[PDB]
A paper describes a structure:
To investigate the basis of the substrate specificity and function of TxgGalNAc-T3, we solved the x-ray co-crystal structures of TxgGalNAc-T3 in complex with Mn2+, a non-hydrolysable form of UDP-GalNAc (UDP-2-(acetylamino)−4-F-D-galactosamine disodium salt, UDP-GalNAc-F) and each of the following glycopeptides: CST1.4, Muc5AC-3,13, Muc5AC-3, Muc5AC-13, and SRS13.2 from 2.2-2.9 Å resolution. Although the glycopeptide amino acid sequences vary, both CST1.4 and Muc5AC-3,13 are similarly bound along the active site substrate groove with the acceptor Thr positioned for catalysis, adopting a similar conformation seen in peptides bound to metazoan GalNAc-Ts. Mn2+N is coupled to the GalNAc binding pocket through coordination to His333 and indirect coordination to Glu554 via water. Loop II flexibility and the interaction that occurs between the Gly319 backbone carbonyl and an amide group on both di-glycopeptide substrates (Muc5AC-3,13 and CST1.4) allows TxgGalNAc-T3 to accommodate and modify substrates with variable sequences.
O-glycosylation of the protein CST1 by the mucin-type O-glycosyltransferase T. gondii (Txg) GalNAc-T3 influences cyst wall rigidity and stability. The strict glycopeptide-preferring enzyme TxgGalNAc-T3 then adds GalNAc to acceptor Thr one position N-terminal to existing Thr-O-GalNAcs and is predicted to sequentially O-glycosylate Thr rich repeats within the mucin domain of CST1. The structures reveal a unique GalNAc binding pocket that dictates the substrate preference of TxgGalNAc-T3, which is coupled to a 2nd metal binding site that is strictly conserved among apicomplexan homologs.
Numbering used by the authors:
A (entry chain C): 1 to 7
B (entry chain A): 103 to 628
């Protein structure tokens, strides 16, 4: 339930 | 009310009393265990969120070139902003609303539709304390609340909002965001010229622990991993772009194979003509890729607006809600309808699942796809995402056990295909823990269940990078040769060591199944 931030 | 720069809809949330309709909290307690507070707040610090004003000033994350652009709010069409939420705290939900209303000219904002996706929190429930509805009376009449009597998920709630929108354009935002100035005007201007463009802003970051505004969030060019999750272009992928596109102007729009999901603007009529959402998607996950693939294949265009910036709270050490475990797997199976023969690789990566993906419902989607004239996924890879490491399945020439016949043992990920642990040698049993695949464009040796984990000559798996650090060659005699050092991998003594390459040494000879997938992916039964 989480989209991760671009590095 | 008193409208001006920074309060384009006026002073919001003020009673006739003259006091705010929302009592801020005191500074968070000094005795605060951040991990525990990240749990109470479902992935972010609600103690600090509740202490921060709703009219929170945010830095202008936009490049200086973006502010030198002029917009004519009388030529632009209006847009309905749609914020859907399930059990979002009051402070974050209402600070998103204040940010939109305060930072969006009324000329271009038709309405702001709030969609409650069956929330259970007492401050939202209709049989609750009425905190939200009472506070909405203190906001413009543009703002409207609608409800799903039972939580339907992201696709279910966004459809409820879109179908209710009355503008020709709609913009979807998460319920925990803060905008940079002039966030909507670049999106409207772009869609005004071509209704087939789905335009997404660049996303920035709000730290879940400290709530600092962070410059870089997600970005523009986005690909996808074979675990069916969007993935920003890595360096070696940007390097494959046409040189005129490896460093575009800060204002030029750029196309993207995929979107992050939930932060995009689109012409309402074209959104429905291009398939809208697959309403048999469940709860959370992967609808952004099904939409991305379907968009490009069926006559649409996906673009990133570097001058449209929105801050977003990325959840850390927690989650705001609970989705069934099988709902995500279903959404990935339904997405694989659009990957054509490539679904064999994706299906193998996510672990050859056998779930109920509503097969009867997906067949009607297949018919829709043929009647619309949508293009293939091979066209998508060769024309939309030609910078990926797997453009055709010939780029994956091996998929199976890496077996050394001398000792009679396969390579084994040792339970964790996740990076950062050591590979081992074990008697072969055929399970997925012993299957490895090869991406020839980057010489990567990965466990089939994670294309972000790459073998290294250290004998351990680590995060994949498109550099010489991870490039392996698989020789015609069966050797795993680290290209950078021209040394081969040996299984001598049930340990993995690098040795001088000698094709007469059986301890460095490996067998690897060739990957020869069928021309058509036949979904598993149910
Ligand atoms: O069953 C659900 C799950 C999520 N959401 C909302 O969908 C948005 C996007 O979900 P999420 O925030 O988890 O994704 P993220 O952008 O945080 O990775 C949020 O505003 C959620 O409140 C919803 O309405 N119903
Ligand atoms: C989010 O982080 C994970 C980490 O495994 C993946 O790299 C994923 O692709 C990331 N998403 C983006 C948008 O880069
Ligand atoms: Mn979010
Ligand atoms: Mn990567």
């Amino acid at each position: 339930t989480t989209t991760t931030k671009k590095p | 009310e008193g409208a001006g720069p920074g309060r384009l809809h006026g002073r919001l949330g003020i009673k006739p009393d003259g006091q705010p309709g929302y009592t801020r909290a005191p500074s968070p307690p000094t005795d605060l265990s951040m991990p525990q507070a990240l749990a109470r707040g479902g992935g972010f610090n609600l103690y600090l969120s509740d202490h921060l004003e709703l009219d929170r000033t945010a830095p202008d994350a936009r490049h200086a070139s973006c502010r030198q652009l002029h917009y004519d709010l009388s030529t632009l069409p209006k847009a309905s902003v749609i914020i859907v939420f399930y059990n979002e705290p009051f402070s974050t939900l209402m600070r998103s609303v204040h940010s939109v209303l305060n930072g969006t000219p009324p000329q271009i904002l038709e309405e702001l539709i709030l969609v409650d996706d069956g929330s259970t929190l007492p401050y939202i429930r209709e049989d609750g304390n009425q905190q939200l509805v009472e506070y909405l009376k203190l906001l413009p009449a543009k703002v409207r609340l609608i409800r799903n009597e039972v939580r339907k998920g992201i696709v279910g709630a966004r459809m409820k909002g879109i179908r209710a929108s009355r503008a020709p354009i709609f913009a979807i935002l998460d319920s925990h965001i803060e905008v940079s100035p002039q966030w909507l005007e670049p999106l409207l201007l772009r869609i005004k010229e071509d209704s087939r463009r789905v335009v997404m802003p660049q996303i920035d970051g709000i730290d879940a622990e400290t709530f600092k505004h962070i410059a870089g969030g997600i970005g523009c060019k986005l690909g996808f991993l074979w675990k069916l999750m969007e993935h920003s272009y890595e360096g070696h992928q940007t390097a494959r772009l046409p040189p005129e596109e490896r460093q575009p102007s800060p204002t030029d729009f750029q196309t993207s194979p995929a979107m992050a999901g939930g932060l995009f603007a689109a012409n309402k009529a074209f959104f429905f003509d291009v398939g809208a959402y697959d309403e048999d998607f469940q709860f959370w996950g992967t609808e952004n890729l099904e939409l991305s693939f379907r968009l490009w294949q069926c006559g649409g265009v996906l673009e990133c607006a570097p001058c449209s910036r929105v801050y977003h709270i990325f959840r850390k050490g927690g989650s705001g809600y609970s989705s069934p475990g099988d709902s995500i797997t279903i959404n990935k199976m339904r997405t694989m309808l659009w990957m054509d023969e490539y679904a064999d690789l994706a299906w193998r990566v996510i672990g050859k699942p056998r779930v109920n993906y509503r097969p009867e419902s997906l067949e009607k989607r297949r018919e829709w796809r043929k009647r619309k004239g949508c293009k293939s996924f091979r066209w998508f890879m060769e024309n939309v995402f030609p910078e990926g490491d797997v453009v055709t399945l010939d780029d994956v020439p091996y998929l199976g056990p890496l077996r050394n016949d001398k000792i009679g043992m396969c390579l084994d990920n040792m339970g964790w295909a996740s990076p950062g642990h050591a590979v081992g040698l074990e008697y072969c049993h055929g399970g997925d823990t012993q299957t490895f695949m090869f991406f020839r464009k980057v010489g990567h040796v990965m466990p089939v269940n994670d294309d972000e984990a790459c073998l290294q000559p250290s004998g351990r798996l680590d995060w994949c990078r498109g550099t010489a650090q991870f490039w392996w060659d698989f020789t015609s005699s069966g050797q795993l040769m680290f290209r950078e050092t021209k040394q081969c991998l040996s299984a001598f003594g049930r340990k993995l060591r690098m040795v001088e390459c000698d094709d007469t040494d059986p301890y460095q000879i490996w067998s690897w199944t060739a990957y020869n997938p069928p021309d058509t992916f036949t979904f598993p039964s149910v």
